[PDB]
Amino acid sequence: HKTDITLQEIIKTLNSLTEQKTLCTELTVTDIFAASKNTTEKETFCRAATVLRQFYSHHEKDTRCLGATAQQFHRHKQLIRFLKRLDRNLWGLAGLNSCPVKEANQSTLENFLERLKTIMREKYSKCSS
């Protein structure tokens, strides 16, 4: 709660940098908004962390949309895992401690970005400072 300049950037940053650095594959990724079933402040975030990881691989594995070989596949993997973990741990929103990954749902990564972007974009744009 004390910090904010963290998610504030991650939002606007990734939100603004959509076309820039991003893999073009559009994979079905569970929808976190699917709270109309079973979502808790712990699990909800956990699942979100998993989704963020998948997306994080997009905005951090290609200059624009060319490459994605089996080579870096195992490399950039540690980069995202480390960065994501560090970021997620920097704020500590999930306040959890690592959890299993499950896709109780399915939604094109594109659809997720549209929903996430819409909220996140209208969230930070609130000018908190």
By DSSP, the count of extended strands is 0
Largest sheet: none
Overall shape? globular
Cα Rg: 15 Å
The helix content is 40-55%
Number of helical stretches of at least 4 residues: 4
Oligomeric status: monomer
Strand content bin: under 5%
How many structurally independent domains? 1
Report the CATH architecture. Up-down Bundle
Distance between the termini: 14 Å
CATH topology: Growth Hormone, Chain: A
Order of helices and strands: HHHH
The secondary-structure class comes to mainly alpha
- CATH class placement: Mainly Alpha
Outline the structure in words.
The chain is globular. It is built from four helices and no strands. It is an all-alpha fold and 129 residues long. The protein is 50% helix and 0% strand. It has one domain: Growth Hormone, Chain: A (Up-down Bundle), CATH 1.20.1250.
Structural topology:
Elements: H1 5-16, H2 43-56, H3 70-91, H4 109-124
PDB class: cytokine
Keywords: cytokine, Interleukin-4, IL-4, disulphide mutant, C3T, Backbone dynamics, Molecular dynamics
Assembly: monomeric
